[PDB]
C-alpha cells in the first residue's frame, strides 16, 4: 500500500527501519495526523529514551535542532514524517 522513502536521515539503519515500522503501525490504527504523531513520539520515548518530537503531515516546512544521530525525515505515501530528539 504505502511507499516508504527516507528523504533525510541522521540516524542508524536499525532506528530508521524502526521509525518506518512504527509509523506504519500508527497509520493502520489512526487517521488523524496528530494521533499518528503522538503514537510515534510515545513509542520512541519508550524505546530510545525521551525526549522525541514528531510532526506528521502533507504540507509543512520546518527548521529544528536535533541531537546527533537522532533525526529522520521520511514519506509514507503522501504523508511526511519528521521525528527527532532535542
Amino acid at each position: 500500500d504505502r511507499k516508504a522513502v527516507i528523504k533525510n536521515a541522521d540516524m542508524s539503519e536499525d532506528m530508521q527501519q524502526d521509525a518506518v515500522d512504527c509509523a506504519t503501525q500508527a497509520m493502520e490504527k489512526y487517521n488523524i495526523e496528530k494521533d499518528i504523531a503522538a503514537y510515534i513520539k510515545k513509542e520512541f520515548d519508550k524505546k530510545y529514551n525521551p525526549t522525541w518530537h514528531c510532526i506528521v503531515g502533507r504540507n509543512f516546512g520546518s527548521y529544528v535542532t536535533h541531537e546527533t544521530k537522532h533525526f529522520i525525515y521520511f514519506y509514507l505515501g503522501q504523508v511526511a514524517i519528521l521525528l527527532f530528539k532535542s
Binding site: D10, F60, G61, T65, H66, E67, S86
Partner: peptide, 9 residues
C-alpha cells in the same frame, strides 16, 4: 546538536 530544514514538495 545540528540544524535541519525540511520542506514537503
Amino acid at each position: 546538536q545540528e540544524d535541519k530544514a525540511t520542506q514537503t514538495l
